[PDB]
Design an enzyme around this catalytic site. Sequence first.
Site, PDB file in Angstrom:
ATOM      1  N   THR A 147      38.030  46.559 -57.333  1.00 41.62           N
ATOM      2  CA  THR A 147      38.087  46.034 -56.390  1.00 41.62           C
ATOM      3  C   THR A 147      36.831  45.074 -56.001  1.00 41.62           C
ATOM      4  OG1 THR A 147      38.897  48.027 -55.338  1.00 41.62           O
ATOM      5  CG2 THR A 147      38.177  46.704 -53.758  1.00 41.62           C
ATOM      6  N   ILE A 148      35.618  45.349 -56.583  1.00 45.15           N
ATOM      7  CA  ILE A 148      34.582  44.728 -56.599  1.00 45.15           C
ATOM      8  C   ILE A 148      34.698  43.040 -57.141  1.00 45.15           C
ATOM      9  CG2 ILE A 148      32.054  44.345 -57.241  1.00 45.15           C
ATOM     10  CD1 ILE A 148      31.918  47.219 -57.249  1.00 45.15           C
ATOM     11  N   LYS A 160      43.488  47.554 -53.343  1.00 49.85           N
ATOM     12  CA  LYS A 160      43.300  48.868 -52.341  1.00 49.85           C
ATOM     13  C   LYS A 160      43.955  48.597 -50.821  1.00 49.85           C
ATOM     14  CE  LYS A 160      39.349  51.710 -54.150  1.00 49.85           C
ATOM     15  NZ  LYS A 160      39.448  50.956 -55.539  1.00 49.85           N
ATOM     16  N   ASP A 186      47.200  47.014 -45.471  1.00 46.73           N
ATOM     17  CA  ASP A 186      48.201  46.812 -44.777  1.00 46.73           C
ATOM     18  C   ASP A 186      48.776  45.479 -45.303  1.00 46.73           C
ATOM     19  OD1 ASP A 186      49.787  46.602 -42.342  1.00 46.73           O
ATOM     20  OD2 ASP A 186      48.231  45.748 -40.913  1.00 46.73           O
ATOM     21  N   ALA A 187      49.660  44.911 -44.512  1.00 47.30           N
ATOM     22  CA  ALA A 187      50.470  43.490 -45.269  1.00 47.30           C
ATOM     23  C   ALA A 187      50.891  43.878 -46.502  1.00 47.30           C
ATOM     24  CB  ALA A 187      49.382  42.513 -44.955  1.00 47.30           C
ATOM     25  N   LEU A 233      50.085  41.011 -49.760  1.00 43.43           N
ATOM     26  CA  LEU A 233      49.026  41.132 -50.540  1.00 43.43           C
ATOM     27  C   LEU A 233      49.543  41.531 -51.771  1.00 43.43           C
ATOM     28  CD1 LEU A 233      46.534  42.984 -48.411  1.00 43.43           C
ATOM     29  CD2 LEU A 233      45.930  40.818 -49.710  1.00 43.43           C
ATOM     30  N   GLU A 244      45.743  54.739 -54.202  1.00 43.50           N
ATOM     31  CA  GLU A 244      44.362  54.906 -54.561  1.00 43.50           C
ATOM     32  C   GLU A 244      43.964  56.157 -53.494  1.00 43.50           C
ATOM     33  OE1 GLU A 244      41.536  55.245 -55.354  1.00 43.50           O
ATOM     34  OE2 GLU A 244      41.105  53.917 -56.973  1.00 43.50           O
ATOM     35  N   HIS A 301      40.632  59.799 -57.289  1.00 39.98           N
ATOM     36  CA  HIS A 301      39.019  59.108 -57.420  1.00 39.98           C
ATOM     37  C   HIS A 301      38.155  59.765 -56.682  1.00 39.98           C
ATOM     38  CE1 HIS A 301      37.405  54.692 -58.092  1.00 39.98           C
ATOM     39  NE2 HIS A 301      36.679  55.793 -58.049  1.00 39.98           N
ATOM     40  N   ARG A 314      32.791  56.818 -55.555  1.00 39.84           N
ATOM     41  CA  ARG A 314      31.341  56.351 -55.910  1.00 39.84           C
ATOM     42  C   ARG A 314      30.295  56.914 -55.231  1.00 39.84           C
ATOM     43  NH1 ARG A 314      29.488  51.563 -59.238  1.00 39.84           N
ATOM     44  NH2 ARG A 314      31.565  51.109 -59.371  1.00 39.84           N
TER      45      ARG A 314
HETATM   46 MG   LIG Z   1      38.287  50.747 -59.042  1.00 44.63          MG
END
Ligand SMILES: [Mg+2]
EC number: 4.1.1.85
Lengths: 213, 215
Positions: A34-35, A62, A65-66, A70, A110, A134, A137
């Site tokens: 994601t980063i 992640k 919506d949409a 996406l 996720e 997950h 973090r």
């Molecule tokens: Mg990740």
Amino acid sequence: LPMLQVALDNQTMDSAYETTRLIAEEVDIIEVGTILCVGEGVRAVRDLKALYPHKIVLADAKIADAGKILSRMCFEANADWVTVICCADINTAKGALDVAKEFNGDVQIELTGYWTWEQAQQWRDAGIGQVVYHRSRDAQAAGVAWGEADITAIKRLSDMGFKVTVTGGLALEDLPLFKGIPIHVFIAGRSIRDAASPVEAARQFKRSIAELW
Amino acid sequence: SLPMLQVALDNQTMDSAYETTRLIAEEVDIIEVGTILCVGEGVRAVRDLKALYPHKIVLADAKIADAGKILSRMCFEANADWVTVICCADINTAKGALDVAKEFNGDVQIELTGYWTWEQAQQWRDAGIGQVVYHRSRDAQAAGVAWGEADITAIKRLSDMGFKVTVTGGLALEDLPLFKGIPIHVFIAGRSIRDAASPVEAARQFKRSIAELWG
Ligand SMILES: [Mg+2]
């Protein structure tokens, strides 16, 4: 055997390449974290798939919506799999899955943050076959360690029919905790990227996995 | 106070976004880098838009789900004023984003897209969050979910909890009266402005209606 996935949580492509140039051939799945998605945009997916076409490329967007919009952006960028955040409206997961099927790809829910078992049932009824268990973090940084509650939940998700990916600051020594469970994928980010020897870190994971499973 | 107007830039490329901003930058109060634009172009979208409109509030709708410190710092280093954290995120994610935000004199909003609970809402308040985005999912909207009594009840409750509430989700000019009497902080319009025959006039109509309904 559970596959090995490397999470590229880098802010720029050149930073990510510092890792892929060392272990791309040592893993089965290359994840655009994601980063990296936020740092470089979807071009990260297109660039990495072009470099490693023989590997599964996951766009960890992640999506909240949409879903169709996406997801299409990620799949047009040649992603194989895309992630939808657990709290998303069920129609978001459905939309992303519909698009994924068009590109012969797949969607993973996720499980970062809060979600319910009722939601889990909806994902299954919607045709979702993958979930990423997950350990956050940030939760990890707050002292939250892996526990029996996690193992119980992972087994429950597996029994529901989901192919389960396990991740969240996993170290080599954590693998035995999940022994006996048909884990689909183990994701290692920091434990591989930041290891003194990324190549050895990756091979150690695969060796342990082959031994345990 | 009159609810402010925010434009959601859910464009996939910067040039597409500019076709909208060149028209309505001075017709709205807040310029939002939509999640779609964040994913399409990356954080440069935030940096470039703030450089074009430094006098405007620029919001990065990143919908941060984890790595609150890292992701929020990326947005704030790109000069964002506000950043969004998705509602299901671990409370430590919101706290992490908020700590970084304060370093850049910015703020954090919790994006209420999807499922969340009142227990979580209380945690956000205790954590120091002062803004929430009550968002009717675009996908839910497409599935037939309309604005209703339940939304009004939740919005009022969130306001009573001390949150400044932003309302959005396929809002049409005709939907504004449904929220009359509630101290809405901001209304976000994306499609209704970007896709209008005249984005400028569409924005002005929202402003006129808001001034009438809350005046
Ligand atoms: Mg990740």
